[PDB]
Amino acid sequence: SVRGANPLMFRANVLHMLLEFVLDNLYLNRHTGFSQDHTPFTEGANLRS
Amino acid sequence: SVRGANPLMFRANVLHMLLEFVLDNLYLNRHTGFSQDHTPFTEGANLRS
């Protein structure tokens, strides 16, 4: 069945999915500049672009 | 808008305008010649041309 799955491998497949979810979050955030606000919604705030 | 100005930039605008005023007002003063008149409402004064 395309719409079916065996309940006896739920734990194994869920924790393999957790492994891939960790391995796709292996990066470093990079500094990408800022710009001083000109509209008065947030006074003096520097927003990342 | 073509007729708009940011109210957060008013002070910088006014300071730049006063700087333009002072830099426009940097001159010396010529001694041009003057001519004596004989006016019934200004007797013998030495008015300048």
Side-chain angles (χ1 to χ4, degrees):
Chain A
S1 176
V2 177
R3 295 181 183 272
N6 192 354
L8 293 177
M9 281 82 78
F10 281 169
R11 182 184 296 126
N13 200 351
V14 164
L15 66 93
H16 179 76
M17 180 268 290
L18 295 178
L19 180 69
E20 293 179 355
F21 182 76
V22 171
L23 264 68
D24 206 3
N25 289 318
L26 294 176
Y27 290 97
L28 274 308
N29 293 314
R30 173 67 66 89
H31 187 195
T32 56
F34 293 100
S35 67
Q36 177 58 258
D37 196 2
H38 290 179
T39 181
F41 291 100
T42 60
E43 69 275 14
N46 296 110
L47 301 174
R48 185 180 62 86
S49 68
Chain B
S1 177
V2 70
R3 62 180 66 88
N6 194 0
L8 294 179
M9 299 300 175
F10 281 169
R11 182 177 295 171
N13 289 315
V14 174
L15 291 173
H16 186 270
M17 186 271 292
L18 293 175
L19 182 63
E20 291 293 328
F21 182 79
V22 173
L23 292 174
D24 198 1
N25 203 358
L26 293 177
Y27 291 106
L28 278 77
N29 288 318
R30 293 297 294 169
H31 179 74
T32 184
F34 60 93
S35 66
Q36 183 179 2
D37 60 348
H38 295 285
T39 302
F41 294 149
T42 302
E43 292 292 330
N46 290 317
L47 307 183
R48 65 181 289 166
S49 66

